[PDB]
Amino acid sequence: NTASWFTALTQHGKEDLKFPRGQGVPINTNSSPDDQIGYYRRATRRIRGGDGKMKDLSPRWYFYYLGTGPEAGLPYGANKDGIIWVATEGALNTPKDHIGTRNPANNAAIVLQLPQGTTLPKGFY
């Protein structure tokens, strides 16, 4: 029933999502500098293509604060396929249960915006 607090980043290439150190956490004026830590989770989508076989669509990457989302129990830095970690300089390695996930019935998604000088990888928008 719950979802990410932000809209997705679309992957148009083969390479997975990877940000430089200290970059990647979306802007959120309601969160504090301590809370600037989390991960992006890939959501693969497939449809009945124009021919007759299942064609894959461009995957989407959704941000979730540390200790929240479908991988709430994973610690920061854990190695898992479809999960890449991000953190701003000075963020605490603690779960963000106080922020939690978004319930779509009461709240719309925040438009994902990255701070000034952020280097998005090739094929990510």
Numbering used by the authors: 48 to 172
From the paper:
We selected NTD nat_mutants to compare them to the NTD from the Wuhan-Hu-1 N protein, further referred to as WT. For more detailed structural insight, we solved the high-resolution structures of all NTD nat_mutants and of the WT using X-ray crystallography. In the heart of this network, a triplet of residues appears crucial for stabilizing the intramolecular connection between fingers and palm: Q58 (N-loop), W108 (palm) and F171 (carboxy finger). The apparent specificity is clearly expressed by a more than 40-fold increased affinity of WT for Ext over SL4, contrasting the merely small changes in binding observed in the two mutants.
One central protein involved in the formation of regulatory ribonucleoprotein complexes (RNP) is the coronaviral structural protein nucleocapsid (N). N plays a major role in RNA genome replication, translation, and packaging and has further been found to interfere with host-integrated stress responses and stress granule formation. The N-NTD possesses a peculiar, hand-like three-dimensional fold, with a β-sheet palm and several flexible loops, arranged as fingers around the central β-sheet. The latter, together with the extraordinarily long basic β-hairpin finger, constitutes the positively charged primary RNA-binding surface.
